[PDB]
Paper text:
Photolyases repair UV damage to DNA by using absorbed blue light. Within the photolyase/cryptochrome superfamily (PCSf), a major subgroup consists of prokaryotic (6–4) photolyases. These enzymes rely on flavin adenine dinucleotide (FAD) as a catalytic cofactor, besides an ancillary antenna chromophore, and a [4Fe-4S] cluster with yet unknown function. For the prokaryotic 6–4 photolyase of Caulobacter crescentus, we investigated structural changes associated with its different redox states by damage-free crystallography using X-ray free-electron lasers.
In the oxidized state of Cc(6–4)PL, the [4Fe-4S] cluster adopts its characteristic rhomboid geometry, which is identical in the synchrotron and XFEL structures. Notably, in the synchrotron-derived Cc(6–4)PL structures of the FADox state, Wat1 is displaced into the same direction, albeit by only <0.5 Å. This may be a consequence of partial FAD reduction due to radiation damage by synchrotron X-ray irradiation as observed before in class I and II PLs.
Residue numbers in the entry: 1 to 508
Write the structure that this text describes.
């Protein structure tokens, strides 16, 4: 009875973490490591580093206040080996333990590494039951399904959680209340001001250290306003539930120039490191509808993103890795344009997405999908390069969620496992859902010439290039019919325009 060494990683900052269950506070030790391996696996946004390390230090203090013995290895510690495995070994050398207990993590490569570590004591790995669907449950649901579709997974998660269920039937008599025909904000409507969290003293200290120590990483650290502990994160959630959730269903796919948050919740960076709980979030939204403070379409749309999409992508990741990370179904080989890093492009929609990534480490979903994701797919950027960008620039990015949304939904590099069709779109889509195109120097009605919106020739070149395959996919009938009715000279024209754009943008 020497006790257990309990590992807590930077995205595991929850009192209810399975590795902390049944802790013997008089014998056990919690290990937390500020890891340069993890901090450089991708060159994470400076604000992601601030968030994780500020949240970790505060979580350690919360554990100590509850009686835990915490071995906390900081970035400045000259004996820190830099890695989780190295620090495990060193912790085990410092005092006697009977075993290591940890919670399976959110990156296949680290999980595979930790599972094969040869340590002097046994290492027990527990599932991360903060998620609503276990890895085993997803595998069992997916078995024998020719295609994995969120629509059907979501119904299963509604029945299992009981969220928005009146007995055995969905509230309102339908599962999903998504509406077609949603469009951009009306000219006069101004998105409301959003609550941000001024840095607390711990966060300020970490801000100063990241500013000095990681200046080469992407992004601005000034203005950091993300919540870094459960009190701050609940404040963000409270604001969303009371002030934004009633409007959540009107504007989920709209874009407004330099209004980067609209009515979104801004909870993903906190949720993905454990500062909020998925079930609790959804129950709070359900209560808003039950009690007459929000309409059902809004609340259902919100809950579907958390118990549906979030759990579905996690399921696909662990079911399909490691091969998933290698898939390149459209044989994309291009380089990522420099403007993905600098924002220096005349494409107003792209420039605004990069602006928000740089300044806030955030862009909302339809920008990630239909602006920068769609563009990378149409350009034929190699999926490794695309995954790298999405991992670096957003404060909510962890591989389990980034990769199926990026390699899958946004770029079809997975051949449709997540998304069932490429989300390709011309500039017409961005024009219908945003206020970007009028102020953009490009003409969204033109396909050819130096004034043409690049998305237009790129879209048709993409449909053309992959025409044989997309006609088999099944769900692209309208674009292929339009392509077919085009005379040959018109097709050759947009092929040449797209070739030019790929040279101009530094792709290929
Ligand atoms: C190419 C691309 C890459 C993405 N990379 C990430 C990533 O690294 N991390 C991440 O957490 N999300 C990722 N997303 C999903 C989604 O864009 C973000 O979760 C969302 O923008 C976060 O903003 P929010 O907290 O304001 O969410 P809201 O719009 O308020 O939505 C509520 C919550 O639903 C969840 N959610 C919504 N859509 C998804 C989805 N598609 N997948 C998973 N959870 C979702 C999040 O928990 C989010 O907080 C990606 C989407 C795309 C298309
Ligand atoms: C920047 C960063 N730093 C750390 C760290 O210092 N220590 C740690 O234990 N985890 C860190 N993380 C999170 C991991 O890199 C990784 O994304 C998660 O552990 C996946 O579950 C991140 C993202
Ligand atoms: S015209 Fe094209 S490039 Fe410019 S904002 Fe519209 S969609 Fe984006």
């Amino acid at each position: 009875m020497a006790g257990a060494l309990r590992l807590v990683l930077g995205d595991q900052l929850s009192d209810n973490l399975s590795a902390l269950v049944d802790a013997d506070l008089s014998r056990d030790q919690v290990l937390m490591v500020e890891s340069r391996v993890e901090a450089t696996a991708w060159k994470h946004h400076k604000q992601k580093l601030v968030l994780v390390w500020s949240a970790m230090r505060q979580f350690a203090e919360r554990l100590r206040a509850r009686g835990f013995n915490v071995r906390y290895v900081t970035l400045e510690d000259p004996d820190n080996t830099g890695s989780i495995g190295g620090e495990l070994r060193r912790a085990l050398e410092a005092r006697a333990f009977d075993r290591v207990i940890r919670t399976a993590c959110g990156k296949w490569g680290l999980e595979s590494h930790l599972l094969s570590l040869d340590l002097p004591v046994p290492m027990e790995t527990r599932e991360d039951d903060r998620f609503l669907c276990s890895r085993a449950q997803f595998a069992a649901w997916a078995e024998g399904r020719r295609e994995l579709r969120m629509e059907f997974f979501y119904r299963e998660m509604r029945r299992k959680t009981g969220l928005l269920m009146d007995g055995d039937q969905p509230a309102g008599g339908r599962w999903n209340f998504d509406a077609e025909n949603r469009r951009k904000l009306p000219p006069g409507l101004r998105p409301p001001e959003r609550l941000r969290i001024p840095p607390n003293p711990t966060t300020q200290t970490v801000l100063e250290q990241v500013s000095r120590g990681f200046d080469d990483h992407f992004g601005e650290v000034e203005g950091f306003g993300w919540p870094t502990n459960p009190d701050e994160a609940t404040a963000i959630l409270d604001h969303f539930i009371a002030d934004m959730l009633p409007s959540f269903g009107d504007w989920q796919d709209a874009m407004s120039w330099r209004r980067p948050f609209l009515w979104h919740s801004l909870i993903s960076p906190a949720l993905n490191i454990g500062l909020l709980d998925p079930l609790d979030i959804c129950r709070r939204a359900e209560a808003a509808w039950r009690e007459g403070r929000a309409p059902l379409n809004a609340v259902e749309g919100f809950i579907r993103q958390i118990i549906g999409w979030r759990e579905f992508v996690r399921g696909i990741y662990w079911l399909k890795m490691p091969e998933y990370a290698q898939r390149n179904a459209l044989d994309a080989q291009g380089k990522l344009p420099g403007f993905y890093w600098t924002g220096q492009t005349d494409m107003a929609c792209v420039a605004d997405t990069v602006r928000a990534a740089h300044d806030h480490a955030y862009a909302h979903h339809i920008q990630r999908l239909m602006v920068t994701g769609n563009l990378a797919m149409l350009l034929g950027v190699h999926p490794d390069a695309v995954d790298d960008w999405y991992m670096v620039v957003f404060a909510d990015a962890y591989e389990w969620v980034e990769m199926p949304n990026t390699r899958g939904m946004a770029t079809f590099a997975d051949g449709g496992i997540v998304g069932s069709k490429p989300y390709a779109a011309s500039g017409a889509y961005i024009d219908r859902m945003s206020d970007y195109c009028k102020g953009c120097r490009y003409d969204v009605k033109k396909r050819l010439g130096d004034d043409a919106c690049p998305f237009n020739a790129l879209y048709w070149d993409f449909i053309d290039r992959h025409a044989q395959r997309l006609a088999g996919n099944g769900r692209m009938m309208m674009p292929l019919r339009t392509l077919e009715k085009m005379p040959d000279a018109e097709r050759e024209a947009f092929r040449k325009q797209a070739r030019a754009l790929r040279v101009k943008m530094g792709v290929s």
